[PDB]
Ligand binder design. Sequence first.
Ligand code: ADP
Ligand code: MG
Lengths: 76, 77, 52
Amino acid sequence: DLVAKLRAFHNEAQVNPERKNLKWIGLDLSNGKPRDNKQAGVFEPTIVKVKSLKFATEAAITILRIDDLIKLHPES
Amino acid sequence: ADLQDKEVGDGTTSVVIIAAELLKNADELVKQKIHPTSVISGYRLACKEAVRYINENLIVNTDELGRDCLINAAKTS
Amino acid sequence: RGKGAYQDRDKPAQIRFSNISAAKAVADAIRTSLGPKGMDKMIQDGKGDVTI
Ligand SMILES: Nc1ncnc2c1ncn2[C@@H]1O[C@H](COP(=O)(O)OP(=O)(O)O)[C@@H](O)[C@H]1O
Ligand SMILES: [Mg+2]
């Protein structure tokens, strides 16, 4: 429910040009309901999200590129 | 996770969760006879647009908040 | 005329067949990693070192 409610608010912000303030809505874990996190003071550095997406994608891409594993037995 | 710690210092748990989820959902497509190159190409495009979207619509300039921004950023961590 | 050399020894034929089978096995093993739609292989050595 929380994700659906959270997604509903964000969907409205993108399709309605006059409801752009809903981009800041996140999660209020204490009460379990969406909340404007920009006003609530829940901030993160932009580099944390940006570098996370770049690094996670490359790591996922690296594993996704494999389709065959040869595991040589140890010499001992 | 170690690389994220060295170059950022935060978001270490998130990046491992996202990467595993990205791989899990990508493998579902591969099982549906979608070629991995198509999935890889799609993931690369989405990562580029996600970064572009963040830098254009989801950033807040800290000069508009003053010292309270630093405390809130520290408190959130 | 009629018949030719008997060729009593059979080992040369077996050796040739085994060589061909091994070469074909190697080629079929690495066939999947060819072309723009080819995927990579992960090889883990006896020491544990991993290469993709
Ligand atoms: N007060 C808060 N209200 C709602 N969500 C929060 C709050 N503080 C942090 N979060 C979220 O919880 C997550 C916790 O991340 P955390 O596990 O500390 O980072 P890391 O991945 O470096 O371990 C963050 O992604 C943040 O978005
Ligand atoms: Mg954290």
